[PDB]
Amino acid sequence: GQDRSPIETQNVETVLRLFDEGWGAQDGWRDVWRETMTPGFRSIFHSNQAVEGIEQAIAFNAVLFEGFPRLEVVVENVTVEGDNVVVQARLTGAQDGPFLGVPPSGQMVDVPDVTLFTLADGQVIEMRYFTDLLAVMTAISAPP
């Protein structure tokens, strides 16, 4: 296969930091987001309207991680073409905090996901996200 261009490989390296030092379960992630994303970064969660601005997008991510404060991510595919990087991962952890209106249940989740990044001049400008959110909401809303 054709090797990644220099820009492609740097784009990947930059994005992959968001799954380690910049992962919301890791202390210090916000500063990694601030060094990686542009100020006008836009975050898109499933079909929700974009959250516009880096601090706004950080705040939104923080809310998600209150629901799953120990959430683990395992990257299992990276695909890059130019300034588009696609990361597929699996998420595992317990819903030990409030999440999208559901009180903490302690349920375990184990789901695939996909994050679709756009970069410009080495910085992340947009992130689109999907998981199996219906399965997550069903699992955590399930009666005792």
Q: Measured from the CB of residue 39, what is the shortest distance to its own copies in angstroms?
A: 23
Query: Which residue from 39, 77, 98, 120 is in contact with its own copies, where contact means CB under 8 A?
Result: 77
Q: How many CA atoms lie within 13 A of 114 on its CB side?
A: 9
Q: Is 142 in the site for its own copies (CB under 8 A)?
A: no
Nearest to 39 by CA among 55, 60, 17: 55
d(CA 80, CA 109): 28
* C-alpha separations of 95 from 26, 28, 52, 111, 143 in Å: 17, 21, 27, 13, 14
Stretch in the footprint of its own copies (CB under 8 A) among 18-26, 57-65, 67-75, 128-136: 128-136
Q: Which of residues 44-73 bind Cl ion (CB under 5 A)?
A: none
Query: Which residue from 50, 86, 94, 102 is in contact with its own copies, where contact means CB under 8 A?
Result: 86
Number of residues counted as binding Cl ion (CB under 5 A): 3
Query: Which residue from 17, 30, 34, 128 is in contact with Cl ion, where contact means CB under 5 A?
Result: 30
Q: What separation, in Å, do the N-terminal and C-terminal C-alpha atoms of the chain show?
A: 51
Q: Which of residues 16-75 bind its own copies (CB under 8 A)?
A: 44, 46-48
Q: Is 8 in the site for its own copies (CB under 8 A)?
A: yes
Interhelix angle 29-36/54-67, nearest 10 degrees: 150
Q: Residue 129 has which token pair?
A: 């996200």
Q: Which residues bind its own copies (CB under 8 A)?
A: 1-2, 4-5, 7-8, 44, 46-48, 77, 79-84, 86, 88, 111-112, 114, 116, 128, 130-135, 137
